[PDB]
Design a protein around this nucleic acid. Structure first.
Ligand SMILES: [Mg+2]
Ligand SMILES: [Mg+2]
Ligand SMILES: [Mg+2]
Ligand SMILES: [Mg+2]
Ligand SMILES: [Mg+2]
Ligand SMILES: [Mg+2]
Ligand SMILES: [Mg+2]
Ligand SMILES: [Mg+2]
Ligand SMILES: [Mg+2]
Ligand SMILES: [Mg+2]
Ligand SMILES: [Mg+2]
Ligand SMILES: [Mg+2]
Ligand SMILES: [Mg+2]
Ligand SMILES: [Mg+2]
Ligand SMILES: [Mg+2]
Ligand SMILES: [Mg+2]
Ligand SMILES: [Mg+2]
Ligand SMILES: [Mg+2]
Ligand SMILES: [Mg+2]
Ligand SMILES: [Mg+2]
Ligand SMILES: [Mg+2]
Ligand SMILES: [Mg+2]
Ligand SMILES: [Mg+2]
Ligand SMILES: [Mg+2]
Ligand SMILES: [Mg+2]
Ligand SMILES: [Mg+2]
Ligand SMILES: [Mg+2]
Ligand SMILES: [Mg+2]
Ligand SMILES: [Mg+2]
Lengths: 70, 117, 104, 87, 65, 271
RNA sequence: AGGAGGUGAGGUUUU
RNA sequence: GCUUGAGUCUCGUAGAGGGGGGUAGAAUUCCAGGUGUAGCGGUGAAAUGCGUAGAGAUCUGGAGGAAUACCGGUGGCGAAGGCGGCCCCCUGGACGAAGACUGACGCUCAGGUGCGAAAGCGUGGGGAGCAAACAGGAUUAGAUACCCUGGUAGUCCACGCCGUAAACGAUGUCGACUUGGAGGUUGUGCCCUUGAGGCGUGGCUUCCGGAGCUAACGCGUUAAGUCGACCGCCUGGGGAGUA
């Protein structure tokens, strides 16, 4: 993420662009993952749990719009 | 005592400390500072305020070299990642480049086990 | 026979012997009764990442209909030669003679 | 197996060189494949994933030979004599 | 919103840097198919060609070097 | 090739042999044969200098070309033979002109293979050429410390030396003991490892197989008397002193190297 | 409403 | 005697399928050096530990081991176990449209044979990181644990041995039938493809649910529904999968 400032470019804009580029690249997530060791056992369980939670939440959000509460 | 204008600021941050090193472009370090050495110790050195105080102290230590334009190379997931750069900018330096050099291996070596707190 | 594609890099300082390398390789292929369907020299171009403390190298691409043994022999020759930095060979399903998208 | 080799085996063992489904043709093809893989399994001794296919071919050839022996012994004897088999 | 399906291409060549730079990012990584709308059949070939290009130094691995 | 024997009698239960069917079951080359008489550890003064040496079996010295100075002329291997004078085996090699010689047998060598010496030779096992043309990272044997003197390094049954670096006129090596050394780049070195790499798996099973090679029994110091050895003395078993060789020098960890003209060549000591 | 980054007495028994 | 089961061949498809041999990069570690000084690291807080013998920080060069960040997705392959950088050689299997051929050659299987996660054993190497055992520092009434500092066997390679797992879909194999809806992946047949479009036909796979079944949970065209063939297993909990 090589961020180079331009002529007459402010500092806050450059800092925010650098932060956004780092967040899009996703290095904090990688370093937090590599701080500990995740077993293949755990990785598969976490991935499956996240996928099923995502599918269930999207289905609930889509199907909860057909009934009112007021 | 040597005069160099184009400088580099290496930042080594972590969850417990933050070290700032002012050097030249060839790697020869000119000055350094750390939050743990800058008064704060224990849980007070993990705050970004300690990181900015260390950055200010490092700037005051390297001011003798006469550095005007500075680039920044940050490495480490720490809260001081922004505070150090803000302090460097407020210290009158000119930030000409910002880069992240955080090492992320390609699944090379096994990391240490997980903590069961 | 079996279609192969070979792309190999060479040092910029040894860019005056690329024709000799090509002549020797095609002579060996013709002696082995192979066929050449495409031959290009991309030139002394820049690299993406430095290799052995340099930034420019000259690339050569060649599509061959050579048999199996001569491909391994050419691999050994490339490995022994210090002028060539690296080489990649790939078994292609069908020979192609359309110009490379970078010869332009 | 090579298409040319399969065509040669079909021409040698079949009648019209196009049936390519007779018991003798199938047994000859399986035997040729087994004999070609003999040299492959004499070096790669840790290739059970491909040795299972060889075992399947052996079982298929044994079943075909049993069917041929039960139907027409005269053809079975000639086939085993030509292929060099023992049973 | 795929593009190779519309183009009706059969294979992918690692020498098309002009289009590999679009599918790779500034950091040098390959973007997922969910951002570009790409089909998996062509995404696998794209990754296989990008790896060979990185080996041949046509494309970089990261922005560090 | 490694075969265990049957326990038909006490003395074969733990015997393991290395049987090589590719050797020559015949007689060696008489023009290359010569006499080699045993001494028994005694020098010109007749006193024992190296202990545990004496007896054994009568042997003959098969001369072997350690220089490989027949540059340019190719040659063909004929047969492998067993050499009692060294752990490894020998290969008989006939040149195109008609000269026959004995060379050390590499790992990948058989009766009928072709070898070629000289600088112009190709990179295949058994070939000899100066290290200036040998690439980096290769494994060699019969390494020469000085050009033209003859191979001295990695002459055992299964040893090899890696070529790690080559700066100027010197080449950096990694020996079988893990030590690094600088050698003149003009020194020739045979390519590949050596043949009998399974020689270390052999065991003897009895004192007879050890005395057949000329190794006399070894007596420990504790069983001796204080006059004979410093460890002697004691009503029972007593070793209340630091281990020491019979001539006063300590052996457990004490260095015995006092050479200063080769420290320039030595880069890193073995660990 | 979607995606990404963390995140809890540090321990403290029996009836 | 027959082709509808099964099987064979011509043409292609995708796949971390298996074995062997090479190569590339990121990163950790160590070594030799250059700049430079009082701390580094770690915890809830500390300490042991590493440091003025110049550490930690930053740059260059080199040494060697292991695994291949993104892509990567309840995505793919394999009988299961299980398989992820790239290239070469050998090889197994599955599927798809057209065709050609044998004419039940079919299913299951006691015993038997083979494969068989990780850990463990022997022989010979290698050993970067992590880490049982082990030592120290902490917490605690005590802590032979949870935390931290180091670290051996091991983890890796080659040949063999053991043949055990929550080896799980807690669901034996093959076959025929019975309303559906959302997708994913991999092929093919057509229609102005008239730009990523519409229709139909196959294989595998994810989820929700109808009749029906079930003690209920739930299964539900990939059944735990409607039926046939074969094999294996259970007959109260402990003792014990032990003597
Ligand atoms: Mg830790
Ligand atoms: Mg004589
Ligand atoms: Mg003598
Ligand atoms: Mg002795
Ligand atoms: Mg002797
Ligand atoms: Mg002894
Ligand atoms: Mg006396
Ligand atoms: Mg004495
Ligand atoms: Mg007495
Ligand atoms: Mg006593
Ligand atoms: Mg005593
Ligand atoms: Mg009590
Ligand atoms: Mg594979
Ligand atoms: Mg295949
Ligand atoms: Mg059984
Ligand atoms: Mg194991
Ligand atoms: Mg072991
Ligand atoms: Mg520990
Ligand atoms: Mg303790
Ligand atoms: Mg069991
Ligand atoms: Mg499961
Ligand atoms: Mg069970
Ligand atoms: Mg069965
Ligand atoms: Mg069924
Ligand atoms: Mg499957
Ligand atoms: Mg359901
Ligand atoms: Mg039931
Ligand atoms: Mg009972
Ligand atoms: Mg028992």
């Amino acid at each position: 993420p090589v961020i180079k400032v331009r002529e007459n470019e402010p500092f806050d804009v450059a800092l925010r662009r650098f932060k956004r580029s780092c967040e899009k690249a996703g290095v904090l997530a990688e370093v937090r993952r590599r701080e500990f060791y995740e077993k293949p056992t755990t990785e598969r369980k976490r991935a499956k749990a996240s996928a099923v939670k995502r599918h269930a939440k999207k289905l609930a959000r889509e199907n909860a719009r057909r009934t009112r509460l007021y | 005592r040597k005069q160099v204008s184009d400088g580099v600021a290496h930042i080594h941050a972590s969850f417990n400390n933050t070290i700032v090193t002012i050097t030249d472009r060839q790697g020869n370090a000119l000055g350094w500072a750390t939050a743990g050495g800058s008064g704060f110790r224990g849980s007070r050195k993990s705050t970004p305020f300690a990181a900015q105080v260390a950055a200010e102290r490092c700037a005051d230590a390297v001011k003798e070299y006469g550095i005007k334009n500075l680039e920044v190379m940050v490495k480490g997931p720490g809260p001081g990642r922004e505070s150090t750069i803000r302090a460097l900018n407020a210290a009158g330096f000119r930030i000409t480049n910002i880069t992240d050099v955080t090492p992320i291996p390609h699944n090379g070596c096994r990391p240490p086990k997980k903590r069961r707190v | 026979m079996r279609h192969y594609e070979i792309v190999f890099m060479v040092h910029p300082d040894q860019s005056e012997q690329v024709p000799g390398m090509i002549e020797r390789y095609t002579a060996a292929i013709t002696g082995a009764e192979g066929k050449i369907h495409r031959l290009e020299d991309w030139g002394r171009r820049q690299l993406a990442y430095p290799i052995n403390k340099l930034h420019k190298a000259h690339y050569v691409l060649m599509n061959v209909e050579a048999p199996q043994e001569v491909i391994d022999e050419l691999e050994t020759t490339f490995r022994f030669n210090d002028a060539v930095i690296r080489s990649m060979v790939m078994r292609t399903k069908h020979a192609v003679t359309e110009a490379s998208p970078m010869v332009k | 197996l090579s298409t040319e080799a399969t065509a040669k085996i079909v021409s040698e063992f079949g009648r019209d060189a196009n049936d390519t489904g007779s018991t003798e043709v199938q047994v000859a093809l399986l035997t040729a494949q087994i004999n070609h893989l003999q040299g492959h399994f004499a070096e790669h001794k840790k290739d059970h994933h491909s040795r299972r296919g060889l075992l399947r071919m052996v079982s298929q050839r044994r079943k075909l030979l049993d069917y041929l022996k039960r139907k027409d012994v005269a053809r079975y004897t000639q086939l085993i004599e030509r292929l060099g088999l023992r049973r | 919103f795929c593009r190779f399906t519309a183009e009706g291409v059969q294979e992918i060549d690692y020498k098309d840097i002009a289009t590999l730079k679009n599918y790779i990012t500034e950091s040098g990584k390959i973007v997922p198919s969910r951002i570009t709308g790409t089909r998996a059949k062509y995404q696998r070939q794209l990754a296989r060609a990008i790896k060979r290009a990185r080996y041949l130094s046509l494309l970089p691995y990261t922005d560090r070097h | 090739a490694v075969v265990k024997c049957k326990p038909t009698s006490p003395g074969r239960r733990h015997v393991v042999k290395v049987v090589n069917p590719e050797l020559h079951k015949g007689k060696p080359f008489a023009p290359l044969l010569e006499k080699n008489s045993k001494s028994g550890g005694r020098n010109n003064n007749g006193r024992i200098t190296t202990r545990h040496i004496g007896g054994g079996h009568k042997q003959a010295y098969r001369i072997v070309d350690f220089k490989r100075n027949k540059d340019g002329i190719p040659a063909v291997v004929e047969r492998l033979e067993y050499d009692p004078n060294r752990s490894a085996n020998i290969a008989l090699v006939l040149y195109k002109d008609g000269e026959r010689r004995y060379i050390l047998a590499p790992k990948g060598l058989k009766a009928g293979d072709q070898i070629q010496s000289g600088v112009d030779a190709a990179i295949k096992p058994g070939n000899t050429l100066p290290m200036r043309n040998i690439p980096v990272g290769s494994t060699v044997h019969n390494v020469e410390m000085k050009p033209g003197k003859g191979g001295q390094l990695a002459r055992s049954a299964g040893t090899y030396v890696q070529i790690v670096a080559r700066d100027g006129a010197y080449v950096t090596l990694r020996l079988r003991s893990g030590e690094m050394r600088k050698v003149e780049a003009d020194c020739r070195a045979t390519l590949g490892e050596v043949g009998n790499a399974e020689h270390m798996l052999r065991v003897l099973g009895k004192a007879g197989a050890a005395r057949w090679r000329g190794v006399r029994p070894t007596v420990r110091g504790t069983a001796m008397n204080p006059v004979d050895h410093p460890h002697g003395g004691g009503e029972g078993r007593n070793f209340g002193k630091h281990p020491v060789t019979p001539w006063g020098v300590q052996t457990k960890g004490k260095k015995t190297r006092s050479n200063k003209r080769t420290d320039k060549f030595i880069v890193r000591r073995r660990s």
